[PDB]
Amino acid sequence: KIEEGKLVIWINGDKGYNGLAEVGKKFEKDTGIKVTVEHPDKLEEKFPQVAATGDGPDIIFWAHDRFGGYAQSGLLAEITPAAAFQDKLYPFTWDAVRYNGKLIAYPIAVEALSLIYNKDLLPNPPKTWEEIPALDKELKAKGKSALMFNLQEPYFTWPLIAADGGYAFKYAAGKYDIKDVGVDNAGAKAGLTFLVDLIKNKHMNADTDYSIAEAAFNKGETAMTINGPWAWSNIDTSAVNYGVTVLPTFKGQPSKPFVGVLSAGINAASPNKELAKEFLENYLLTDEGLEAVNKDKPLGAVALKSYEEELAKDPRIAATMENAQKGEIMPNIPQMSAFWYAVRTAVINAASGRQTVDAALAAAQTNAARAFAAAEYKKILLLKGFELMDDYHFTSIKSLLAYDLGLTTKMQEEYNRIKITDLMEKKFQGVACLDKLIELAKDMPSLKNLVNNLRKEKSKVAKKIKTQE
Ligand SMILES: OC[C@H]1O[C@H](O[C@H]2[C@H](O)[C@@H](O)[C@@H](O)O[C@@H]2CO)[C@H](O)[C@@H](O)[C@@H]1O
């Protein structure tokens, strides 16, 4: 149901989608192929849901960390550029889009967070995180604040969590150990404790989000923010004179941002794969194509060598790359989505006071390190739960799940057992989806045997996890 003879492109709303649309208009004039750029609200999650049914955009843009999961799910076409084209982009950017030996997207640009500071409020910005409480107290006396940044997305807190030792999945001997997670080690706990202490002491508010922090910095209300290159053009438009610099150190160690490569994947369901390749290789990944996007919202350090030679002269790009070199390339492994979910929960719960730092990170550690087992829990839920109950009992469960899963009346009537299994596991990660069905079915007498077996399947998996760990 993707239309043949047209290109639909999805890219996140913080990127230069109007510039990308200009590249699309040029393509349409040359080829007669309409190009429509959209930026739907929850892109990285709408795509895997609609693409799994054969729908969605021809081309999907996101940082490379989500792409290995998309590839494992059969959502992406293999990328096979000629050697001459491969030579046009930096090898480490191709590495970010290589998964299981094959290229699964075109790399576009390299993103890392930097410290952005107001040069008039703060000519000499702090070198350490530890200086920020005293700096905030100074600025509060002048009706200003020291620092505001998005606390709702763990991407922005990760550099501080990683500074003294936190890590996602351990990398050694050229491979990631998806069972060695570094979310609850001493360094991670120290970094998140520092952040939570900033909030407890009223140097930041737990509810600060992207929009609040951007407006506060761009209006001159806060002296510093933490953001990526896409944010610079809105600061240019503002009255604020800003610098982009190395992130503060923590316990004398650099902040370690997770480095993202904005990447463009081709939907395996697209009937326009040849046109998508033409657009990406010969329109976007040219000096003129990247310039059109970059002039809208800066891309960062682009993957195209010819254009990066120009951008590298910008001290904001030098600062981006200095922070990138102190950080780490994100894994692209399929477990990244579950890792980010677990860490998002931990940061939000610790910052808001719903959990201590220790308990929040302990749970995130467990959740991320058991993410490998998510497919097996889903299989148990589908094969030993839903497929073993008649339509009547399935409908009753759908009724009980409707509030939490957002099921309308039509959805309750039409959704099959596979769709419900998928929705449940997204809402109740891993083992929680199986616990949920047990909880709902425990008091239906005709499902007594079904529930008994679900409990044994649940223990059986926990045993295999306890054996393999
Ligand atoms: O916060 C978790 C989130 O982090 C990264 O998302 C970044 C993205 O890479 C940036 O380009 C920009 O859009 O900010 C996002 C954070 O809000 C990961 O790429 C993403 O998968 C993950 O969920």
Author numbering: 2 to 470
Quote the study that presented this structure, word for word.
Indeed, both hNLRP12-PYD and hMNDA-PYD, two targets that failed to crystallize using fusion proteins expressed with the V28E vector, crystallized using fusion proteins expressed with these new vectors (V28E1-V28E6). Remarkably, we were able to crystallize and solve their structures using MBP-fusion proteins expressed with more than one vector. Similar to the hNLRP12-PYD, the human MNDA PYD domain was crystallized as MBP fusion proteins using three different protein expression vectors V28E3, V28E4, and V28E6. All of these fusion protein crystals diffract very well which led to their structure determination. Structural analysis shows that the designed “helical” linkers are slightly distorted probably attributed to crystal packing. Nonetheless, the target protein structures from all three different crystals are essentially identical with an rmsd of 0.30–0.40 Å, demonstrating again that the MBP fusion strategy enhances the crystallizability without alteration of the structural features of the target proteins. Structures of the hNLRP12-PYD and hMNDA-PYD determined with different linker sequences in different crystal lattices show no significant perturbation of the PYD structures.
MBP is one of the most commonly used protein expression tags due to its exceptional performance in enhancing the solubility of the target proteins. The death domain superfamily is a structural motif found in many proteins that are involved in physiological, as well as pathological processes. To explore broader crystallization space, we designed a series of protein expression vectors V28E1-V28E6 containing helical linkers of different lengths.
